[PDB]
Scaffold this active site. Structure first.
Site, short mmCIF file in Angstrom:
data_model
loop_
_atom_site.label_atom_id
_atom_site.label_comp_id
_atom_site.label_asym_id
_atom_site.label_seq_id
_atom_site.Cartn_x
_atom_site.Cartn_y
_atom_site.Cartn_z
N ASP A 198 1.15 7.79 -5.16
CA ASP A 198 1.83 7.16 -4.03
C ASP A 198 2.91 6.20 -4.58
O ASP A 198 2.85 4.98 -4.41
CB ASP A 198 0.84 6.39 -3.15
CG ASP A 198 1.47 5.84 -1.87
OD1 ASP A 198 2.62 6.17 -1.58
OD2 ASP A 198 0.81 5.10 -1.13
N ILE A 199 3.85 6.78 -5.34
CA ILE A 199 4.94 6.07 -5.98
C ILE A 199 6.06 5.84 -4.95
O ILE A 199 6.70 6.80 -4.50
CB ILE A 199 5.45 6.92 -7.18
CG1 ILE A 199 4.27 7.22 -8.13
CG2 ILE A 199 6.59 6.20 -7.88
CD1 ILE A 199 3.32 6.08 -8.57
N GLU A 200 6.25 4.57 -4.55
CA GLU A 200 7.27 4.23 -3.54
C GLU A 200 8.50 3.44 -4.00
O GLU A 200 9.51 3.43 -3.30
CB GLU A 200 6.66 3.45 -2.40
CG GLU A 200 5.60 4.35 -1.85
CD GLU A 200 5.01 3.99 -0.51
OE1 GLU A 200 4.94 2.82 -0.12
OE2 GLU A 200 4.60 4.95 0.14
N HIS A 201 8.48 2.81 -5.16
CA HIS A 201 9.60 2.02 -5.65
C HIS A 201 9.47 1.90 -7.15
O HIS A 201 8.40 2.23 -7.68
CB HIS A 201 9.60 0.62 -5.02
CG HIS A 201 8.28 -0.12 -4.97
ND1 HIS A 201 7.53 -0.37 -3.91
CD2 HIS A 201 7.64 -0.68 -6.06
CE1 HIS A 201 6.48 -1.04 -4.30
NE2 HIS A 201 6.55 -1.24 -5.61
N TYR A 245 4.36 -1.60 -10.56
CA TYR A 245 3.96 -0.46 -11.35
C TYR A 245 5.28 0.14 -11.76
O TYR A 245 6.26 -0.01 -11.01
CB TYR A 245 3.12 0.51 -10.47
CG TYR A 245 3.66 0.88 -9.09
CD1 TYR A 245 3.31 0.12 -8.01
CD2 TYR A 245 4.47 1.99 -8.94
CE1 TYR A 245 3.76 0.48 -6.77
CE2 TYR A 245 4.94 2.35 -7.71
CZ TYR A 245 4.56 1.59 -6.63
OH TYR A 245 4.95 1.97 -5.37
#
Ligand SMILES: CC(=O)N[C@@H]1[C@@H](O)[C@H](O[C@@H]2O[C@H](CO)[C@@H](O[C@@H]3O[C@H](CO)[C@@H](O)[C@H](O)[C@H]3NC(C)=O)[C@H](O)[C@H]2NC(C)=O)[C@@H](CO)O[C@H]1O
Length: 273
Positions: free
Chosen positions: A125-128, A85
């Site tokens: 829930d943006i992690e990378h 994403y």
């Protein structure tokens, strides 16, 4: 306050209707639209629950209607630990807000993936990936509330303050509920005996961002995260007595329904939240 829970990443955790009928959760985040951005066709991943092709996941609108009639709020979570994403431009933010409106919220599409129900909002829930344009995505999704029904915005940043992916987005003040993940991050999580790394982190967050309510995000079992688990008795005796004083306290969020069932964590803490 209440318990927010992530559902959708283990096929043996029960249906969305079984999850809402538990009466333990007030918020359910459906986990993961894990591919979108950069001209990719968006895809939802709900593990073994259903395959979204030819409307396989359209049965999920039943569980969304069930949860909503019981006053449970239901968000679609963007991101997660695994996925391509990203947002490539401000234009991409507009295009993705658009797709989300028409396919999950009040707009219209022939091919709505989880069916005809209208979700309450979008969880970040943006992690990378890029650290850019997420603030624009949150603005374009808020603007849709002007066409009458409110789009809720939530975020699950991890506990190092500021979050590199979500800090600019959290600074807009558009978010309703923020559930900070106090796990997989040794400098702000619980380690046996030491509660001061998590409390001190809780203080940076509840005093720094302009948001409706902040939740303490935790793993529901020692097996759900690499690190960060807090035993029920420590949570109830030592952490919640201190964080419930905060006016911004919303409750606790738990990574996974699946683990919560195996471990009975909600069952242990539900009245203390
Ligand atoms: C400890 C923990 O919770 N880790 C999370 C990961 O499990 C999760 O990735 C997802 O893992 C599940 C379980 O292995 C994957 O489910 C499988 O998916 C295939 C189709 O993709 C399906 O045939 C399997 O039946 C299904 N297994 C079950 C038991 O349902 C799922 O595809 C993985 N999700 C993704 C996006 O790849 C990730 C997701 O970010 O989060 C971890 O924290």
């Amino acid at each position: 306050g209440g318990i927010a829970i992530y559902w959708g990443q283990n096929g043996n955790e029960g249906t969305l209707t079984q999850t809402c009928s538990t009466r333990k959760y007030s918020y359910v985040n459906i986990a993961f639209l894990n591919k979108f951005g950069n001209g990719q066709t968006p895809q939802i991943n709900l593990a073994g629950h259903c395959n979204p092709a030819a409307g396989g996941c359209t049965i999920v609108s039943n569980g969304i209607r069930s949860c909503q009639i019981q006053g449970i709020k239901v968000m679609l979570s963007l991101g997660g630990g695994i996925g391509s994403y990203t947002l490539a431009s401000q234009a991409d933010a507009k295009n993705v807000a658009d797709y989300l409106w028409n396919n999950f919220l009040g707009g219209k599409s022939s091919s709505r993936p989880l069916g005809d129900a209208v979700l309450d909002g979008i969880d970040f829930d943006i992690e990378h990936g890029s650290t850019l344009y997420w603030d624009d995505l949150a603005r374009y999704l808020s603007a849709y509330s002007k066409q009458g029904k409110k789009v809720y915005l939530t975020a699950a940043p991890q506990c190092p303050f500021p979050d590199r992916y979500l800090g600019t987005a959290l600074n807009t003040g558009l978010f309703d509920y923020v559930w900070v993940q106090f796990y997989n991050n040794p400098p702000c999580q619980y380690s046996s005996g030491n509660i001061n790394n998590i409390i001190n982190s809780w203080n940076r967050w509840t005093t720094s961002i302009n948001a409706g309510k902040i939740f303490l995000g935790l793993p529901a079992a020692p097996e759900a995260a690499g690190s960060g688990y807090v035993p029920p008795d420590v949570l109830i005796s030592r952490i919640l007595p201190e964080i419930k004083k905060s006016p911004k306290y919303g409750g606790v969020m738990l990574w996974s329904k699946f683990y919560d069932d195996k471990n009975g964590y909600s069952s242990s803490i539900l009245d203390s939240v």
